[model samples]
Target: SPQKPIVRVFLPNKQRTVVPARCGVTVRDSLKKALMMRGLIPECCAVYRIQDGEKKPIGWDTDISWLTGEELHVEVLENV
Candidate 1:
C-alpha cells in the first residue's frame, strides 16, 4: 500500500480521477483501466500524460511518486 500511493490524474477537458501505483501496471495502463472502469476510455480510448510545452509524452514506465508537478496530464493528442 505504501508503494501504491495516491495521486490525481487530470485530463485536458478537466476530467480527473485517482489511481493506485500498482507494482505491475504501467501509468498509462492504469489510467486506461481507470477510464475503462468508469466507461470513459472504452468509448474514447487510451490517454497519456505529459507536462506543458514538453515534446515527448511521459513514459508509461514513469512512477507516480517520481512526479513532483502533477500525476497525469492528458494532452491534445489522441495517442502519445
Candidate 2:
C-alpha cells in the first residue's frame, strides 16, 4: 500500500497527536515526535497501550506499521 498507516498518541496533556506510521518507524520514534511537538520531554516518559484499563508497556523498537488507527497511551515518568 502506498498510504502509510496512522496512529494516534494521547499525550500527558490530554492532547491527541496523530502521526503517520511509515515503514521502519518505531513506537518510540512516533511517541517522541508527539511529545516533541507538544514541548514535552520524551526521555522522561514512557509509551504503552491500554487494554482493560491496564497499561501494556510497548517496546521502543516495536514496529507501528501494523497498528493502524490504534490509540497509544503515554505516561509521564516524573512528578510535575
Candidate 3:
C-alpha cells in the first residue's frame, strides 16, 4: 500500500482535524465530508492555506494530491 499523506484542517472555532489526502480529486471533494462531520458546512465558508504565517485562499477545484503537510483554515462566514 502507498503511504498516505495527510494535512491539518483548522476550523473557525479553533477546532482542528487531520485528513488523509485523496488523489484524483478536487480539494473540496477531498475534505468536504470530514469537515461536515466535524460540524462545518463547506459551502458556507472560505478555505485558505496557511503557510509562512500567511493565509492564502485556496480554490475548491485545486487538486488534493498536489498538497502535503499543508495547514488549511476554514472560515465560516454565513449563518446556516
Candidate 4:
C-alpha cells in the first residue's frame, strides 16, 4: 500500500484533526469534503498553511503537497 500523507487541521477554538491527503486535490476542497462528510461545515473562514511557526499563504487552488509536513497545519477562521 502507498503511504498515505496526512495533515493537521486546526480550528480557532483549539479543535484539531488529521486529514488524509489525496493527490492533486485543493486544500479547501479536501477540507470541506472531509468536514461535511463528518457532519460539520466551515462557514466564513480562510485557510492557511502554518510553517515554521508562521501562517503561510494558501488558496482554494493550493495543492495539499504545499502544506505537507509533520507540523503542517490547516487553519480555519470561521466560528465552529
Candidate 5:
C-alpha cells in the first residue's frame, strides 16, 4: 500500500497566532512567541506567502499539514 500525499495550506501571515495543536503547538503559536520575545506586536497580520519544499506557491484551497517559520522563495498573491 502507498501513503497519501501530504497537503499544504497557506495561511495569511497577519492571521498567524498562538494555536494549540497535537504537535504541542502550531507554527502560528511559535511565530507569536518569537515576535513577543522580541517585543514586537504578536497580533500583526501580514501576507503568509508560503511555498512547498519544491519552492512552489500553494493554491488558496490546498490542504497543508505542516508549517515552518522560514521565508518562502516563491511568488505569492495578496488575500482580498
Candidate 6:
C-alpha cells in the first residue's frame, strides 16, 4: 500500500485541527466546508494547515499536530 498524506487545519484564532491521511483537500476548501457545516460566517480572514506525511507542514508555516482521522479541534475568534 502507498503512504497516506496528512493535513492540519488552522483556524483564525490559532487553533489546530488535525486531518488524517487521504483527507486530500486544500486548506481553504477545508475551512470553508467547516464553516458552512457549522453555519458560521466570519467577517475576517482565516488560515489553515496543510501538513506532509512526516507530521510536518508543507507549504504554509504554522502550528500542526498528528493526523487522527477525526475532527480534531476548532476555535472561534471573538468580536468576529
TM per candidate:
0.54, 0.79, 0.82, 0.67, 0.34, 0.32
TM-score, model 3 to reference:
0.82
RMSD of 3: 2.4
What TM-score does structure 5 among the candidates reach? 0.34
Record all residue pairs in model 2 with backbone atoms less than 3 Å apart, i.e. clashing.
Answer: none
Q: Lowest-lDDT window of 10 residues in candidate 4?
A: 69-78
What is the C-alpha local distance difference test score of each model?
0.57, 0.77, 0.76, 0.63, 0.35, 0.41
lDDT of 6 at 74: 40
Local distance difference test, candidate 1: 0.57
- Ten contiguous residues with the weakest lDDT in model 1: 42-51
> Residues 1-80, candidate 3, lDDT per residue (tens digit)?
87888878787688877778777877687678767788677787777887788888887787766666688877887677
Compose the digit string of candidate 6's lDDT tens values, residues 9-64. 55544544444333444444555555555565423444422345323323212222
**TM-score of model number 1:** 0.54
Per residue, candidate 5 scores C-alpha lDDT tens digits across 1-80 of: 85333212223443223322223444345444445554553344322434354444433232222433334222224355
Estimate the Cα RMSD of every predicted model relative to the unseen true structure. Answer: 4.5, 2.1, 2.4, 3.1, 9.8, 7.9
Error of 5 at 20 (Å): 14
Q: What lDDT tens digits, residue by residue, belong to model 2 across residues 1-80?
A: 67766888788868787788756888778777778878987677777777798878877678776565778877788776
Candidate 2 residues lying further than 4 Å off, grouped into runs, are: none
Clashing residue pairs for model 3? none
List model 4 lDDT by residue over 9-51, tens digit each. 7644555666777678877777776566655564545567665
On a 0 to 100 scale, what is the lDDT of residue 74 in model 5? 20
The better-scoring model by lDDT among 3 and 6 is: 3
